Write a protein that binds this DNA or RNA. Structure first.
Length: 86
RNA sequence: AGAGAU
């Protein structure tokens, strides 16, 4: 309840800025901003960062795609460092 | 893996 930013790693570009956002905003409620840090050199190391409205949403995203084997790659969808511990 | 380039 204090974070909101997810980290997305290893995954075919099926997930792109708009699709990750569509998935995030509908499956997860509006992704405020999706950071595509890689993909500038080339489609290599496609990892991203996505921003969500509060966490129910972000926490939702990591739950939905983490551990997904897509095209032979296991997705590493994770949310920010948990600040809802205590 | 867990940091913002586009």
């Amino acid at each position: 309840m204090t974070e909101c930013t997810l980290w997305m790693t290893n995954f075919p570009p099926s997930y792109t800025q708009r699709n990750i956002r569509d998935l995030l905003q509908d499956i997860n409620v509006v992704a405020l901003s999706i950071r595509l840090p890689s993909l500038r050199f080339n489609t290599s190391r496609r990892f991203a960062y996505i921003d969500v409205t509060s966490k129910e949403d972000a926490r939702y995203c990591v739950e939905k795609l983490n551990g997904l084997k897509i095209e032979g790659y296991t997705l590493v969808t994770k949310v920010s460092n948990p600040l809802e511990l205590e």
